[PDB]
Ligand binder design. Structure first.
Ligand SMILES: *[C@@H]1O[C@H](CO)[C@@H](O[C@@H]2O[C@H](CO)[C@@H](O)[C@H](O)[C@H]2NC(C)=O)[C@H](O)[C@H]1NC(C)=O
Ligand code: NAG
Ligand code: NAG
Ligand code: NAG
Ligand code: NAG
Ligand code: MG
Lengths: 196, 180
């Protein structure tokens, strides 16, 4: 443990498509070879005797872990980072409703929110007017999972004739200091009638 | 003519997961196209360290490249390519792994050319080396020079660059820098 490498910031959250400066450093007295192994495109480098700073750009993967290294005498000293991306709910889509829905029968509401995430930070809600019918947090999904779907069966009523159904996606990155990003679908009107 | 052929494939963190899968598919396709008696294969992954994922005896027993490569996990570390090449020369072309002493030795090295080590590959001098370039990092001058350093000569004939569908991204990037 006497000589080391360090990568700062060691964990970073970037908006999908964004960029980030990383600084890889060592206390090795005379480092022989130094670098940063990542699949990310770079767009800027700065160097000093015991440090290397790189700007990584167009960061699109859910997760990537750059490996910073310096060769120190006979040893390679390394440090590993984590870059996570987030993607706002730019697309929130409620699937089409039936042209006409029989009263007293079920129909399906499906909200699709492609690409947004991390999925564990998403909450999707299905609404009739301003009333929330179903709310689902995706807490506990895998960290690299993206996108979400929320489907529910709803019993058609006479009252629901002409009512607007919609859905809302929330990406809550506030635990990470990054804000709450919301979007809602365009409304869809239900038309009901009695088969009798 | 008997030919012992080794795939030396880059499992370093600089290659995307989709690119590594394409490297695996490339190896499978080459094997299917040369599935005769005369060629026998081995595959070695390299990143920081080296792993013979299958050897010539494995090839002969299983034949199915899907079978032979099922246990491969992407190493996701550094790119010690000179070391890897030296490992193959001294440790993989051996009778113990089923190599035939009568066979012509060939190495197919698949990498973005961004080596994190240095040295020489003199131990591999008498092995025919074909280089397969892949990845955004193969596009730099230093990477292109590295790939040519590894190749048998004339490097023009032994170096090939896989098109993974990102050439327009490389163009935009370059133009954005020169045009602004
Ligand atoms: C990257 O990190 C290093 C160290 O954390 C930065 O600062 C220099 O570090 C050297 C030792 O490597 C020290 O001797 C100096 O005191 C530091 N200089 C300054 C001006 O603070 C280095 O500047 C960082 N580089 C970038 C681009 O942020
Ligand atoms: C790329 O580098 C240039 C300066 O060299 C800078 O102006 C630009 O912001 C960088 N690209 C990105 C995506 O930040
Ligand atoms: C909401 O959607 C639009 C595209 O329909 C998008 O441009 C905007 O960034 C989104 N807002 C948030 C906070 O996700
Ligand atoms: C509608 O769906 C609910 C929930 O699955 C079910 O219990 C009920 O039997 C259904 N009603 C009709 C009219 O089919
Ligand atoms: C549903 O939406 C339409 C327009 O989008 C609106 O005119 C109508 O009042 C709404 N239906 C009601 C009142 O529930
Ligand atoms: Mg690499």
């Amino acid at each position: 443990e006497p000589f080391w490498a360090d990568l700062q910031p060691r964990v970073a959250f970037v908006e999908r498509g964004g960029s980030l400066w990383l600084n890889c450093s060592t206390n090795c007295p005379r480092p022989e070879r130094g670098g940063l192994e990542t699949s990310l495109r770079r767009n800027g480098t700065q160097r000093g005797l015991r440090w290397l700073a790189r700007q990584l750009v167009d960061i699109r993967e859910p997760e990537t872990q750059p490996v910073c290294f310096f060769r120190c005498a006979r040893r390679t000293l390394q440090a590993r980072g984590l870059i996570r991306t987030f993607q706002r709910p730019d697309r929130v889509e409620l699937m089409p409703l039936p042209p006409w829905q029989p009263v007293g029968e079920n129909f399906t509401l499906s909200c699709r929110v492609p690409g947004a995430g991390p999925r564990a930070s998403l909450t999707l809600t299905l609404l009739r007017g301003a009333q929330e019918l179903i709310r689902r947090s995706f807490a506990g999904e895998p960290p690299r999972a993206r996108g979400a779907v929320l489907t529910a069966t709803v019993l058609a009523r006479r009252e629901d004739h002409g009512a607007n159904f919609s859905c809302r996606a929330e990406l809550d990155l506030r635990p990470h200091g990054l804000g709450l990003f919301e979007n809602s679908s365009a409304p869809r009107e239900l038309r009901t009638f009695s088969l009798s | 003519m008997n030919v012992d052929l080794v795939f030396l494939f880059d499992g370093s963190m600089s290659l995307q997961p989709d690119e590594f899968q394409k490297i695996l598919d490339f190896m499978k396709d080459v094997m299917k196209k040369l599935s005769n008696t005369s060629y026998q294969f081995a595959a070695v992954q390299f990143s920081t360290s080296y792993k013979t994922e299958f050897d010539f005896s494995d090839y002969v027993k299983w034949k199915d490249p899907d079978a032979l490569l099922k246990h491969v996990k992407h190493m996701l570390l550094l790119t010690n390519t000179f070391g890897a090449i030296n490992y193959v020369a001294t440790e993989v072309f051996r009778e113990e792994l089923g190599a035939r002493p009568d066979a012509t030795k060939v190495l197919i090295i698949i990498t973005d050319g961004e080596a994190t080590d240095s040295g020489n590959i003199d131990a591999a001098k008498d092995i025919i080396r074909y280089i397969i370039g892949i990845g955004k990092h193969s596009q730099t001058k230093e990477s292109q020079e590295t790939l040519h350093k590894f190749a048998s000569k004339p490097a023009s004939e032994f170096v090939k660059i896989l098109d993974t569908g990102e050439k327009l991204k490389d163009l935009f990037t370059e133009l954005q820098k020169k045009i602004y």
